[PDB]
């Protein structure tokens, strides 16, 4: 069965350290750039408001089979696997805690977190069970708006809610615009909505940016990182035992596909560290560090590439 990475280094700021996101993340660097990722959590008395504009939030999420790549005689009328379902954040949310409390008979809060984890790699690798889940990944903040409070005049603001639309840990005030001289010759955060087993496979982001992710609400989110001094690592893993008719295929389209058990590369000599991100926790990946991961149940997540 599976074994659980070593845990991602966890960090606990004091109010002084938190005052400052990206000199906090320049301080942290000596450790953190040698997992890829790591986790913030902020002051107990930080606690931002949920600010999306909830009656109106509806999405289509995409379906996940979580065996697709294994399962590669075709299948009768492949390409038609799933219904198409529109949902609200509610209707969502009752989906998925039926999803998960069915599939493990107990209630959702109840199931361990080393257990999800533990049934998502079997069913990954399981081509006699196949289990389909839907993720509302990927969805713009100018949507619904953020899930942070914005000063942009879309929504009210309470006083005491001021302050994290002024956060600079607000996702929505972290830095985005890369230099260059093309800048002078010439982003915004996406959304997550998650239920147990839907997952993101491994990647790296463009311009090899930072990241910063804020789980605001629900059921932790696992992660798995690797620390870019084993990127090229991780990838010769990758082309050595990723099917052949996507091993040719460019970085953007192959990391569509990059779905891979982390064993198999702690096996083969990639560092990997792992972490569950719990809600009101960040989690910062560093240029060029390679994640993947899975939620563990319902829960709403915050993104956004950030540049230093
Ligand atoms: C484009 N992109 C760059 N980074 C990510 C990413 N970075 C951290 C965390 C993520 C998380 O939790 N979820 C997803 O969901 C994406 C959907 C994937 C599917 F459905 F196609 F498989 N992405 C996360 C996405
Ligand atoms: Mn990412």
């Known amino acids: 069965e599976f ?12 109010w002084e350290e938190f005052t400052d996101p ?4 320049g301080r942290i660097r000596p450790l953190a750039e040698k997992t890829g990722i790591c986790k913030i959590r902020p002051p107990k008395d930080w606690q931002p408001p949920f600010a999306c504009e909830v009656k109106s939030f509806r999405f289509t999420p995409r379906v996940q089979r979580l065996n697709e790549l294994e399962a590669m005689r075709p299948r009768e009328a492949f390409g038609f696997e799933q219904a198409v379902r529109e949902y609200t954040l509610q209707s969502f949310g009752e989906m998925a805690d039926n999803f998960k409390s069915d599939y493990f008979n107990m209630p959702v809060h109840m199931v361990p977190t080393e257990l999800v984890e ?6 990954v690798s399981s081509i006699e069970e196949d289990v389909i889940v839907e993720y509302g990944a990927d969805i713009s903040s ?3 708006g953020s899930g942070f409070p914005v000063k942009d005049g879309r929504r009210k603001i309470l006083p005491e809610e001021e302050e994290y639309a002024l956060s600079g ?6 830095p985005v615009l890369e230099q260059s001289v093309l800048a002078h010759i010439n982003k915004v955060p996406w959304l997550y909505v998650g239920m147990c087993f839907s997952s993101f496979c491994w990647h790296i982001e463009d311009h090899w940016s930072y990241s910063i992710n ?5 059921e932790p989110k696992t992660w798995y990182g690797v620390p870019s001094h084993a990127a090229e690592q991780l990838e010769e893993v990758m082309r050595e035992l990723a099917p052949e008719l996507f091993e040719s295929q460019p970085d953007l389209l192959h990391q569509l596909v990059t779905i891979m058990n982390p064993n198999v590369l702690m096996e083969h000599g990639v560092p990997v560290y792992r972490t569950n991100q719990c809600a009101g926790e960040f989690v910062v990946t560093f240029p060029r560090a390679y994640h993947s991961g899975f939620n563990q ?12």
Request: aromatic letters at 22%; hydrophobic letters at 40%; a negative charge.
């Open 22 to 25: 990206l000199s906090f993340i």
């Open 214 to 218: 804020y789980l605001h609400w629900g």
């Open 169 to 174: 840990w607000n996702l929505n005030n972290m």
């Open 118 to 123: 533990k049934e998502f790699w079997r069913l």
């Open 3 to 14: 074994v659980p990475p070593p845990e991602c280094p966890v960090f606990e700021p004091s």
């Open 297 to 308: 149940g319902y829960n709403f997540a915050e993104a956004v590439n950030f540049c230093t």
């Open 142 to 144: 100018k949507d619904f």
